[PDB]
């Protein structure tokens, strides 16, 4: 989860993430920068590089520790960017030497007057730190029409959907300004489409600050979206708008689903993700009529056993291997693809798209040799 913690902490706009570790552990800066820029572009916000600072530890620090270097790096971050918050991330080579980041963090927090949050890397260090030090306490303002939506990335799917309910969306944590994180205690509810991700932070928000958490079926499939929207409306007292939106969307979407079903008839899929997320995708596929068998060498064996037309995955490294077997994968960089009523059609025509791309993957499969020995191929 260290990569996810670093990505979340560095994706908070107006904040600076300090990587207390050798230069090697900062290699993720390029990955995080690419994800950050693409998320900004998708969200429509101005695009720019993120500024992650590494303490750049060397042998001297591995021996005698790097507290002085950490303090120097935090001062550098403050002077260069004057952020609204500073996070600190610690790697294995720095965990082994057992540097005490808490003391310097508290001291510099007192000196600068902004949060200095040492990330300790069901639970998430970045979310815990945001709640501890950034989320406003006993707010004097309550936003009855504000809802916290906990997501990693993806386009504005909840924006328009909840707009039809007259509700505003507060996207956290990624791409959120420090102002947005602070005001999450003012929102009228916290909706998390991802049970695994959003459960901890939303539960803590409700318990400590009184912002209700919406616990309902995920917005996947017609029934799931119906229940989800109705729960949102009940919590935020917008039943009339929710019913109007549901009727409109049912009328608009139900026809096209027939043509989509005809086009997707006979297609066999495959899903391999967290049971929570996989459940929604499998529900949407069942709506479209696609067949699902159920839920990196073991992946090779699984794909050989099943031989699906397409796969749905959410972890890196799985797709390239499936590509070499001739199986396209649904690109879930935007996890919001299948959310809501329009999500059904989006996923349907995305499946139709990746079925066309099968031509590339079949060529690759024909003209490549995998690095696995033949004998190992005869094992499960």
């Amino acid at each position: 989860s260290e990569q996810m913690v670093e990505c979340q902490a560095g994706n908070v706009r107006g904040a600076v993430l300090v990587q207390h570790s050798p230069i090697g552990c900062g290699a993720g800066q390029v990955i995080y920068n690419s994800i950050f820029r693409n998320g900004l572009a998708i969200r429509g916000l101005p695009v720019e590089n993120l500024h992650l600072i590494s303490t750049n530890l060397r042998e001297r620090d591995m021996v005698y520790g790097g507290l002085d270097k950490l303090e120097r790096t935090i001062r550098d971050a403050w002077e260069r960017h004057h952020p609204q918050a500073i996070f600190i991330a610690t790697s294995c080579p720095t965990a082994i030497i057992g540097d005490d980041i808490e003391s310097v963090a508290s001291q510099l927090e007192a000196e600068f007057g902004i949060p200095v949050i040492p990330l300790h890397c069901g639970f998430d260090a970045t979310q815990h730190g945001i709640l501890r030090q950034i989320v406003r306490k006993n707010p004097e303002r309550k936003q009855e029409d504000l809802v916290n939506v906990i997501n990693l990335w993806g386009s504005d799917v909840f924006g328009p959907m909840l707009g039809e309910l007259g509700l505003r969306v507060n996207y956290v944590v990624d791409l959120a300004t420090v102002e947005d994180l602070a005001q999450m205690s003012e929102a009228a509810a916290t909706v998390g489409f991802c049970y695994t991700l959003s459960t901890y932070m939303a539960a803590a928000l409700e318990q400590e600050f009184g912002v209700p958490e919406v616990k309902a079926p995920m917005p996947y499939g017609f029934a799931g979206t119906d229940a989800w929207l109705r729960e949102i409306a009940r919590v935020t007292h917008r039943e009339e708008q929710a019913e109007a939106y549901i009727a409109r969307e049912h009328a608009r979407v139900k026809p096209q689903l027939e043509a989509l079903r005809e086009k997707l008839k006979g297609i066999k899929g495959f899903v391999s993700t967290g049971s929570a997320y996989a459940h929604g995708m499998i529900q949407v596929l069942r709506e479209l009529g696609v067949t699902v068998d159920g839920s990196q060498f073991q992946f090779y064996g699984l794909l050989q056993r099943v031989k699906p037309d397409f796969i749905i995955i959410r972890h890196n490294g799985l797709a390239p291997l499936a590509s070499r077997l001739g199986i396209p994968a649904i690109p879930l960089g935007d996890e919001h693809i299948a959310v809501g009523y329009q999500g059904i059609l989006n996923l349907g025509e995305s499946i139709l798209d990746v079925l066309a791309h099968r031509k590339f993957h079949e060529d690759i499969a024909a003209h490549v040799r995998l690095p696995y020995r033949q004998d190992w191929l005869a094992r499960d």
């Binding site: 994800i35 820029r37 693409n38 900004l40 572009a41 998708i42 695009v47 990335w153 890196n316 797709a319 390239p320 499936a322 590509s323 070499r324 396209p328 994968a329 690109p331 879930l332 960089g333 935007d334 059609l345 989006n346 025509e349 798209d353 066309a356 791309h357 099968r358 031509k359 590339f360 993957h361 060529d363 690759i364 003209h367 490549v368």
Partner: protein, 436 residues
């Protein structure tokens, strides 16, 4: 309608660029008084910034027109050092009815290497002009053929009739790739245009080539039929210009079967090229399959028939992209249009599409707007005219033909194996630059 907004080509006399594409050949333009012959030698500049200095540019001389054309020819002959002069005529000589043959014949009887092509602008575009120029060269410079005097026909030499020079923006690299591929399987290639050509010596050797390869849907068919009637040379028509390993292998095997080449050499060359190509494609598969933020699923191709069909074939068969809309803008003759449409109908074993023929950019843009590309923005393969439309659709644009005013083109190619890899680089560097 008749109106053409944002022209997709130029007049026949714009085929002077075909003449200037032959090394050490200088066209002499006669458009009337001759105000804006510069409208062409500068039009190629606003294609991929290539310039005609290799055989033309400001170097090009330009103009009763018989007396004045004769004065121009006399002046150019004594100043410019060229292996061959091509005299092209425009509107005014055609309408007035100037006898250009009488003006240019006397020099030819004198032994000067000069030809004239009657290429009235209002007759057609620069594709018809290109065919006129090639036929004029064949008739007036190559001349008749005698195997004893000139040399025995070589069954494994090929004349390549292909992309239109200076209008197909990447013609130099593309012809280099075509020549490299054809020489790989053991042919002697008369590429006839661009840096790889030997010049007028190659054109003099046209009669003693084994066959003519028309590597385009329709351009060059006229020339190949003319050469068949004149020298009795057989013709191989290969309407799809190959991009990528699949189509390139098919094309090479087809040419080897036609010319009776050694199959072992052909297969060895194909195997080596495929090894390289598929190593690079294996490297590319990670991006193609994993890219988080999605890639275009549909595409539209707007351009001349040659590159239009080549790109459609490559995008459908190599990438599995969905053909959204294909419009051919070079105005091919009505006789060949059904064959082109047939090529589009069988674009893949399980994919069938269609091609339209429009020459007015307003109609093309309205057709693109009226088209449904799904919930993702498409990728446009067009020209500078489509940049605004591409921005409007929130999609990517790749400039693949005239006018490519935002490409600086030196040696780029999009054909064969190496050109296919370059094309993939261009396409997917453009797509990922959405957040750049």
């Amino acid at each position: 309608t008749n109106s053409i907004e944002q022209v997709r080509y130029i007049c026949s006399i714009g085929a002077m660029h075909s003449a200037s594409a032959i090394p050490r050949v200088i066209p002499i333009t006669h458009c009337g008084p001759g105000c804006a012959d510069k409208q062409f030698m500068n039009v190629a500049f606003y294609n991929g910034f290539q310039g005609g200095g290799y055989g033309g540019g400001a170097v090009v001389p330009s103009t009763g027109g018989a007396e004045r054309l004769d004065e121009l020819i006399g002046a150019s002959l004594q100043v410019l050092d060229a292996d061959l002069f091509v005299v092209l005529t425009g509107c005014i000589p055609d309408l007035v009815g100037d006898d250009i043959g009488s003006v240019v014949g006397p020099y030819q009887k004198r032994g000067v290497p000069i030809v004239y092509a009657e290429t009235g602008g209002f007759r057609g575009n620069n594709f018809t002009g290109h065919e006129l120029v090639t036929k004029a060269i064949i008739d007036q410079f190559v001349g008749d053929y005698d195997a004893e005097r000139d040399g025995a026909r070589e069954p494994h030499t090929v004349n390549v009739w292909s992309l239109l020079p200076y209008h197909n923006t990447f013609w130099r690299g593309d012809l280099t790739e075509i020549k490299r591929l054809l020489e790989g399987i053991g042919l002697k290639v008369n590429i006839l245009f661009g840096p790889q050509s030997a010049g007028v010596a190659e054109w003099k050797a046209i009669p003693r080539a084994g066959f003519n390869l028309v590597l385009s849907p329709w351009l060059g068919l006229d020339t190949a039929r003319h050469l068949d009637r004149k020298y009795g040379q057989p013709t191989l028509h290969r309407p799809i210009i190959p991009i990528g390993a699949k189509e390139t292998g098919a094309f090479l095997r087809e040419v080897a079967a036609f010319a009776g080449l050694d199959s072992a050499v052909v297969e060895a060359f194909i195997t080596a090229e495929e090894a390289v190509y598929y190593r690079y494609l294996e490297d590319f598969t990670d991006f193609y399959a994993e890219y988080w933020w999605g890639l275009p699923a549909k595409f539209a191709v707007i351009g001349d028939s040659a590159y239009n069909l080549a790109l459609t074939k490559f995008l459908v068969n190599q990438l599995g992209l969905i053909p959204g809309l294909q419009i051919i803008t070079d105005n091919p003759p009505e006789e060949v249009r059904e064959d082109i449409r047939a090529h589009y109908h069988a674009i893949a074993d399980d994919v069938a599409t269609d091609v339209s023929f429009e020459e007015d950019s307003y109609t093309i843009h309205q057709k693109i707007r009226a088209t449904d590309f799904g919930h993702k923005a498409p990728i446009l393969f067009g020209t500078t005219w489509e940049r605004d439309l591409a921005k409007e659709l929130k999609g990517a644009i790749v400039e693949v033909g005239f006018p490519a005013s935002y490409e600086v083109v030196l040696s780029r190619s999009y054909l064969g194996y190496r050109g296919a890899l370059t094309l993939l680089e261009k396409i997917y560097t453009t797509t990922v630059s959405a957040s750049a």
